[PDB]
Amino acid sequence: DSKVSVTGLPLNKGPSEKIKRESLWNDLKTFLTENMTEESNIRSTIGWNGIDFENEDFCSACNQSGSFLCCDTCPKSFHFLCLDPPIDPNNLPKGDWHCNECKFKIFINNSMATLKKIESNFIKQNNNVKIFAKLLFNIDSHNPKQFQLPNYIKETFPAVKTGSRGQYSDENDKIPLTDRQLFNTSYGQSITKLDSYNPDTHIDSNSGKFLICYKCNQTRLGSWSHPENSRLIMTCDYCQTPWHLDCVPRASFKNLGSKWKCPLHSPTKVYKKIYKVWKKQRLINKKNQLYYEPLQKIGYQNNGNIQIIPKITQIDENSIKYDFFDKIYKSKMVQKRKLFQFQESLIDKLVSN
């Protein structure tokens, strides 16, 4: 029938000479079945019956890709939910669809003396809220948008960056993998999962010595006449402390989603379970982060938002020492006197009998 299939040629055709050259060197018992299968309908539920321009390739509102309803007058295109009001993709009114801006233009007949007229009349009518008059008149000339924070708000926090499609990123995003486009190409079986080669993953890149795991205090480099003794060292993304995969019970190398964080950072969110929430702020840089050094040391509380020196409270190791010891001592003695009073009350209640 002459149409090529997966094999390269028509189905009613043997192999070509090129394939057979570069690919060469130079009664049964399931006849049965329609005799042994007998249907099963033993189940419990058997009772159940059962200007010739073209529009843009992106949404004018969210600036992303998809299936667009387009406008004929102007090259704008919108998603269906990205309109005002959103349109049902099935029940689409055919006829001439225009956007808000072109509809405003055709309504005013592209005459702005009439814009003067209607806006003056509008501001005369909306006498109750005269401050919001002109504002309330401009909203009707704009095609819809989506919300994006003003840039004077995003730039108060410097660890915050707008992602690709206007998404949130906060320094815990590892990065997209650029030479992992180079990874689809790769070096042959020299994988990005870090297998089969760990002689130079146990060696400090810059200094030259070995990376020693924090928990076991060894760099088990193994010996590559016996590769079953290596132990897959990995370093934290924040403090660069090295850990074995068998010590932090992880079984993976974090490569794509976020940065891996050592067990040696305190929290960033608590859930006290008593339940209450954070004791950790955001990093308000721009050199508006003001510090305070309290004049009293052994009682100041102020937050879980301290900074340790040799609003952010500046505190030193001595005050932390004293506060820890004080808290545990007084909690100790208070719980002991509570048990004392309970047990003595118990004895006078029991001898009362």
């Binding site: 402390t241 040696l264 305190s266 301290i306 340790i308 505190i315 932390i320 020492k321 506060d323 820890f324």
Partner: peptide, 30 residues
């Protein structure tokens, strides 16, 4: 008497300064 030795032992055994700082931050949170 011995708690001074405890805090000095912790400072020695941690080995680093950033790790000791994070340790002190944990202690402060508690």
């Amino acid at each position: 008497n011995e708690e001074v030795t405890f805090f000095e032992k912790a400072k020695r055994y941690i080995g680093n300064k950033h790790l000791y700082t994070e340790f002190l931050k944990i202690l402060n949170l508690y």
